[PDB]
Amino acid sequence: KNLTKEQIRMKNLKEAFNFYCKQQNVTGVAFTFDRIVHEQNVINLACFMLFLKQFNILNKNKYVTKREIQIMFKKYALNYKELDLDHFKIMIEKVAIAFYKEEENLSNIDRVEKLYQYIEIDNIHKFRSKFGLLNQPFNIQVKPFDQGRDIVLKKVDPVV
Amino acid sequence: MREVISIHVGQGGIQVGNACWELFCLEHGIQPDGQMPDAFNTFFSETGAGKHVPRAVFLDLEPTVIDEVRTGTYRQLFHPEQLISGKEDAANNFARGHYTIGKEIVDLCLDRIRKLADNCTGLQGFLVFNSVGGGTGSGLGSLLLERLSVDYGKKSKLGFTIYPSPQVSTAVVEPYNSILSTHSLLEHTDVAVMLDNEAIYDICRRNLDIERPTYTNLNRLIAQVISSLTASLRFDGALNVDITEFQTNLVPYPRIHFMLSSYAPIISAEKAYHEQLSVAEITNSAFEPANMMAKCDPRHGKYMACSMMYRGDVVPKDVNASIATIKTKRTIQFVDWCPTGFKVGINYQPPTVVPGGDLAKVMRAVCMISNSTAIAEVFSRLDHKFDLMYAKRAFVHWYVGEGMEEGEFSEAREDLAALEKDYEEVGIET
Amino acid sequence: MREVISIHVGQGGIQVGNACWELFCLEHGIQPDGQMPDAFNTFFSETGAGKHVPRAVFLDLEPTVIDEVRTGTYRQLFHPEQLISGKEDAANNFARGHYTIGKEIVDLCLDRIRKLADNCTGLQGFLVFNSVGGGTGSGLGSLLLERLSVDYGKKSKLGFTIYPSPQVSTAVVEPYNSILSTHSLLEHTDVAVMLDNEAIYDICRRNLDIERPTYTNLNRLIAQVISSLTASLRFDGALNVDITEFQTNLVPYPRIHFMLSSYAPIISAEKAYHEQLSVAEITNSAFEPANMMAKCDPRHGKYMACSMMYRGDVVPKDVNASIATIKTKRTIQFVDWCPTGFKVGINYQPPTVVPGGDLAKVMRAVCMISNSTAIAEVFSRLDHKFDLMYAKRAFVHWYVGEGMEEGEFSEAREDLAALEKDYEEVGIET
Amino acid sequence: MREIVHIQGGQCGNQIGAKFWEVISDEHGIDPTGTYHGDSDLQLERINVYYNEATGGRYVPRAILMDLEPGTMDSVRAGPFGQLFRPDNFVFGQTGAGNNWAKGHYTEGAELIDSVLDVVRKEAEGCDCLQGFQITHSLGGGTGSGMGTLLISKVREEYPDRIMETFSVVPSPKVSDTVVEPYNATLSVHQLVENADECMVIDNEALYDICFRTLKLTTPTYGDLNHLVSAAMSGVTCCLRFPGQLNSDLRKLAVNLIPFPRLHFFMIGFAPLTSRGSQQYRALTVPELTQQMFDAKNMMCAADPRHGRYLTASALFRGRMSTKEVDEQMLNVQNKNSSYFVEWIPNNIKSSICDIPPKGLKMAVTFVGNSTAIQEMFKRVAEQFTAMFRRKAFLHWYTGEGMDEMEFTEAESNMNDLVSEYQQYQDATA
Numbered sequence A: 001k002n003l004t005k006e007q008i009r010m011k012n013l014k015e016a017f018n019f020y021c022k023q024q025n026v027t028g029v030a031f032t033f034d035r036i037v038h039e040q041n042v043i044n045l046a047c048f049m050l051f052l053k054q055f056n057i058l059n060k061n062k063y064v065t066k067r068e069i070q071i072m073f074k075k076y077a078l079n080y081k082e083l084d085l086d087h088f089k090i091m092i093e094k095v096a097i098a099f100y101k102e103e104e105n106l107s108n109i110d111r112v113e114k115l116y117q118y119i120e121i122d123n124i125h126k127f128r129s130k131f132g133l134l135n136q137p138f139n140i141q142v143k144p145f146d147q148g149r150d151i152v153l154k155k156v157d158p159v160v
Numbered sequence B, C: 001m002r003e004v005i006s007i008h009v010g011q012g013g014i015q016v017g018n019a020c021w022e023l024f025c026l027e028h029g030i031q032p033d034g035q036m037p038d039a040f041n042t043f044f045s046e047t048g049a050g051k052h053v054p055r056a057v058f059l060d061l062e063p064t065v066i067d068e069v070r071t072g073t074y075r076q077l078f079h080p081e082q083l084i085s086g087k088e089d090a091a092n093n094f095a096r097g098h099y100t101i102g103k104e105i106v107d108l109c110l111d112r113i114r115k116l117a118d119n120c121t122g123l124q125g126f127l128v129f130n131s132v133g134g135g136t137g138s139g140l141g142s143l144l145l146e147r148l149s150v151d152y153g154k155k156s157k158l159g160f161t162i163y164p165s166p167q168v169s170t171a172v173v174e175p176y177n178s179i180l181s182t183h184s185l186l187e188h189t190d191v192a193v194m195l196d197n198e199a200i201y202d203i204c205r206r207n208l209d210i211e212r213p214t215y216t217n218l219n220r221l222i223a224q225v226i227s228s229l230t231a232s233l234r235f236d237g238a239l240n241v242d243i244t245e246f247q248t249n250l251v252p253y254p255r256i257h258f259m260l261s262s263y264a265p266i267i268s269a270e271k272a273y274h275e276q277l278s279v280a281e282i283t284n285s286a287f288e289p290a291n292m293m294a295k296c297d298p299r300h301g302k303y304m305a306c307s308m309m310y311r312g313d314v315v316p317k318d319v320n321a322s323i324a325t326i327k328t329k330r331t332i333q334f335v336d337w338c339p340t341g342f343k344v345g346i347n348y349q350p351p352t353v354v355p356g357g358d359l360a361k362v363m364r365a366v367c368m369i370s371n372s373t374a375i376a377e378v379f380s381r382l383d384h385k386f387d388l389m390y391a392k393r394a395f396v397h398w399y400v401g402e403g404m405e406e407g408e409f410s411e412a413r414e415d416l417a418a419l420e421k422d423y424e425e426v427g428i429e430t
Numbered sequence D: 001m002r003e004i005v006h007i008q009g010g011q012c013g014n015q016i017g018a019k020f021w022e023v024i025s026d027e028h029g030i031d032p033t034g035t036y037h038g039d040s041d042l043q044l045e046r047i048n049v050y051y052n053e054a055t056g057g058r059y060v061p062r063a064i065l066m067d068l069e070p071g072t073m074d075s076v077r078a079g080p081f082g083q084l085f086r087p088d089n090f091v092f093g094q095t096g097a098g099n100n101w102a103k104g105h106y107t108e109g110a111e112l113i114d115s116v117l118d119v120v121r122k123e124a125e126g127c128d129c130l131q132g133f134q135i136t137h138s139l140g141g142g143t144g145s146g147m148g149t150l151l152i153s154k155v156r157e158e159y160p161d162r163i164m165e166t167f168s169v170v171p172s173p174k175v176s177d178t179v180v181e182p183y184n185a186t187l188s189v190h191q192l193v194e195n196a197d198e199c200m201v202i203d204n205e206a207l208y209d210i211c212f213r214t215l216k217l218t219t220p221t222y223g224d225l226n227h228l229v230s231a232a233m234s235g236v237t238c239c240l241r242f243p244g245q246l247n248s249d250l251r252k253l254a255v256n257l258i259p260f261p262r263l264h265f266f267m268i269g270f271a272p273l274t275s276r277g278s279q280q281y282r283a284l285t286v287p288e289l290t291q292q293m294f295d296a297k298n299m300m301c302a303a304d305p306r307h308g309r310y311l312t313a314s315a316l317f318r319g320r321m322s323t324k325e326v327d328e329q330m331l332n333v334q335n336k337n338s339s340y341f342v343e344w345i346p347n348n349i350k351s352s353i354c355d356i357p358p359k360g361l362k363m364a365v366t367f368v369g370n371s372t373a374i375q376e377m378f379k380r381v382a383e384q385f386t387a388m389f390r391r392k393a394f395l396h397w398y399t400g401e402g403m404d405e406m407e408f409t410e411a412e413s414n415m416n417d418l419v420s421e422y423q424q425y426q427d428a429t430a
């Protein structure tokens, strides 16, 4: 199977979007499942800043500071709080325009293309290796031989 | 076959709605359970057998007041699912109740409004109550008015807003949302009545002789004013007045519809019966500047039109003989382009007394609704208060972060400047 | 001279049958011993002197629930040898209860059905209850329906199946047998009603204000719905409806007979009497998407036909005045080829209350049975869940080793695809 | 609804909570065994704010207790009302920090915090509607001032829209019990300004001064300081748990007391406070409460409030009283002290009334004022910090655990910038 150039990119961007949507620290008690499903399909400001930080964009210049990103987010986000997949793409394009704002000779399209090369989105393995959490364990109240044991089973192989 | 629907939003709105709904139930003989042990039809509806249901809806995002209502003696009266309640309060933030949490609640309120309107056949108009200096009150009132103005169109809506006092204030940020809400209801409400608390405090202190009043005493006077205004729709009278017969008599121009009210007599049973309470003296007391229900001086401006309601055993000739005396006085002057400015209504039913209340039982009363040029002072002082903090952009971050744009504050300022210029332009003689 | 026979199979079926059989005995005045201390004939039969015997049969392969029934207070009511019980449970395996152990039990059930049917003279139809996400329930329900469809032919059968919730689930393998049972009853049942647990949990939480519900609270609401559906056969009413008068009014095409239900009002005695419970407000509450008895959004699809039952002191003109309001609303839209879509029934007997239960006593109630195009979402999500595990052939060995063929899974998938295509084809306008 | 969870860290925070929860339980009539034995109905209506419900009818606080050493929590369990706390919420390490900020924030506090964050997430995800969190900790200790502040950032990163409270005890130079207090105070203030929505400073020196001068008791102990802090803590959220004339949640105070997002450091005070021998002489009146409320010695901080000008002020009256008197007294306290109130924001005092007084008292007041006089505390803290840092004294302890001097320089610069920009508005004029 295959995907379009903007979409392969679109497929990889959707994979990043779905990963960061799940990282949201939802505050509140006794949610509806509809709200949980909604929050899994949108990115909040914290997860968008986490994305920009992990991709080494946040605070790199005066146009991508925490405050500038917050203003941009409130301006382009759904309900001023949330990004869907389409608004997430628009926000990345706006961040690309801001991040390369001092490069006067670049078109806005070339600024977006330069950002997509900077994040290495065309290489799914390198792009995915930059994805980082926030936090979870699987609920287990936690605390010489710790070093790992790769039990290489003996091939009861074609020769053996 | 004549009906009216009252909307109560915010803590102040609900607390004055409670005050008016004891009075209406008492005046029509309906027990607090809703059961009687053809005039009720204006405010109530018959269920077929037994109880009556008010044509009112209560709105609030903060659940405490509604929960207090749903456990008091009036738990059986209101329909269980017209007391719409939220979970999170707007916390005096106007942008919250207009952009963030009010939008998810407004749809249920509009559905309830439709379900109540389909029952009425002769709908006269809507009434709305909201304290302006709060987040949810002002924001939800603005949003509801904006939705109703397009859903129904030409139906008349009346707003009994409570503006902040000149110097006495409970919050610190109420000028911002007061100005924004005035912006919103300037182009969306047909009538707005001034109700600031300081004037009514002075009225209670001087006449009722209460030195420690609470909000209930204020709300009872407001309820009496509402009852006097709407008496003509549900009682026989020699000179009737309808709600739709206002913009033709009190509103010279579409922009100018803010007016201030007064009531008379206000007196306690301990010294009420020692004096005769003639119609002349009560109509003189009603025009006294110290008895205005809003803290504004009518001596500082012209009058435009006066609509004033009587009820009891008053005779029209005595009313005319008193209007002549007021026209005679040199301290009250009307605008040049208005030769006659009085609209008079006479009703037969005397005002009803609430047990354990402040007011005594009397046979004559007068309620005036007067439109005057002097109202511009409250706008000027609110504007001055707004400018002081908007110069340094204080408290703005609490509004920009709730979805509102930066420029939204300026255009409300421009509309207030336009209103103040219009009030000056109208008051000059030809 | 009108009768109906109810079939209860599986643990969920028996536990909802108990719930409906307290309610019927209470509604007809029959004590738990079966003795009264001409409307009973629909559900019961007279023995000549004294006790009444229900026209119901209980089926299960696992003996615990039947043994609990045979020792409770209702031990004297049911005939001792119509509580058919097995020895070995199917253990959530559909192939077990359709091919291995259900076949040896089905003959006794069919003999009991014949012995009950020969007594009835005006048999209206059959009722069947079964939780779909279980082995014995789904398998035996499928086998019984398949036997009855050929033994009797044109007699009407109604199925109150309980599909699994969108995300909440008790088992891990329930999509497989849910899909297979839907395959089986698609071509064999005249009416199927949706009953997933999550929606009813939300209803209890929001309206009944119970934060820790159990299965009994759910089953009582289901029993109330059943009683409302079958009230018209045993009580006098101004506008009667029979069971046979459904496929002519709710079923546009033979394939499409899955519909979802709702009930109103649902309210506790602590705050029920504070509001008037008019017919307009209850019929508005019944159409609210949040009050659907199945977790589906009606705003996502068109309506095809609505059959909705009233009971109490409701007057037809008030019903018409409320149907008009619903037709007015812009958020509810019907399909193009259906100008009128409402069938209305009115009954006089108010709903009965069960002591110690949740619901209070009210004089008006409404139960709606609505067929809508939005139901395809549950099929789509169940199909998606099925495909994930069927891609790797997980858990299939538990089914192939119980006599079922490998290809039997694919054709159920094809029938679901056909049903989903049919639902899309019907909902497009001409 | 709109409830909050309690999180405390360190020895000082644990001792504060050990009295705060006792005060709350005594207010709601909860016995030390978790069984309700109260008298009034209102004592149970809003108990979900602080207490959870478990089987058997007993109540359990939603508090989380954390420390790097087990001694303090092993001691608080044996105290009165120590059994209420759920044993699962106790999380502790085996090493401790030794008053070293680096150890409690980089090396040891980083590994342990995952377990406490797990239970914090469990508590917040479950609750009906979150209002926010309140934090009690001390800035004079290592483990507290490190782990608490890092937990603040971790919580803020996951719940950016909720509100956050912190009651912080800062080390005064008068009563010094630790030599390394300036380092971990300065490091903590750097992180605290960036994440906390509200901060309330409390000083042991001011508590001793109050106990010696107003109560005039001979031998103060930590139990009295804890009791005063607990009463002040309870006074803030009283109207959120009880009905009142003007309810005002924490978010409403946040809107009205913080003009700019970085100015959120308040100092508080509680009234009335009288000696045992003079408790019969005094008469509780609103003037008597308001004169003690604005008294300089009554503040819970050594900062002198007549050395600066109030940006804004707040008061939370308790008990049943007239609102007119409260408003006029607030106006009078602002007209007679115009020199100490900033002039470019008019009407900068917020008031609220709650009808439920504290147990044993008829009237009470909690005061929260944002003043420019708080600069003096940061000035002296930074003075001691720069006196000790210039010689690199005790620096090796911090630098041996991955920290460097650059983070000290940045912290000092940011703290000095905060000091400067906080007083920038003191000299600002309109």
Ligand SMILES: Nc1nc2c(ncn2[C@@H]2O[C@H](COP(=O)(O)OP(=O)(O)OP(=O)(O)O)[C@@H](O)[C@H]2O)c(=O)[nH]1
Binding pocket: B009, B010, B011, B012, B013, B015, B016, B062, B089, B090, B091, B092, B093, B131, B132, B133, B134, B135, B136, B137, B138, B162, B164, B169, B170, B171, B174, B197, B215, B216, B218, B219, D245, D246, D252
């Ligand atoms: N006349 C009168 N005014 C009131 C009453 N209660 C509150 N107010 C006024 O309302 C203003 C603040 O708005 P509130 O009604 O209290 O609160 P709100 O409208 O619900 O807005 P929120 O704060 O978001 O809940 C105050 O300045 C008061 O002057 C009342 O009972 N009578």
Ligand SMILES: Nc1nc2c(ncn2[C@@H]2O[C@H](COP(=O)(O)OP(=O)(O)OP(=O)(O)O)[C@@H](O)[C@H]2O)c(=O)[nH]1
Binding pocket: C009, C010, C011, C012, C013, C015, C016, C062, C089, C090, C091, C092, C093, C131, C132, C133, C134, C135, C136, C137, C138, C162, C164, C169, C170, C171, C174, C197, C215, C216, C218, C219
């Ligand atoms: N509404 C409702 N659903 C139930 C009840 N009991 C069980 N269920 C549902 O039934 C499904 C499983 O089928 P069961 O009825 O429990 O068991 P079964 O039908 O007898 O099938 P076996 O497991 O072979 O015994 C579960 O997913 C439940 O959702 C009940 O009391 N009320």
Ligand SMILES: Nc1nc2c(ncn2[C@@H]2O[C@H](COP(=O)(O)OP(=O)(O)O)[C@@H](O)[C@H]2O)c(=O)[nH]1
Binding pocket: D009, D010, D011, D012, D015, D016, D099, D138, D140, D141, D142, D143, D144, D145, D176, D177, D178, D204, D222, D223, D225, D226
């Ligand atoms: N109010 C109050 N303050 C206390 C108490 N115990 C200690 N403190 C203060 O806490 C400071 C020491 O904090 P510390 O115990 O080292 O905090 P930790 O490092 O987190 O354990 C001292 O300056 C005391 O003034 C108490 O019981 N009550």
Ligand SMILES: [Mg+2]
Binding pocket: B010, B011, B062, B089, B136, D247
């Ligand atoms: Mg409020």
Ligand SMILES: [Mg+2]
Binding pocket: C010, C011, C062, C089, C136
């Ligand atoms: Mg079973």
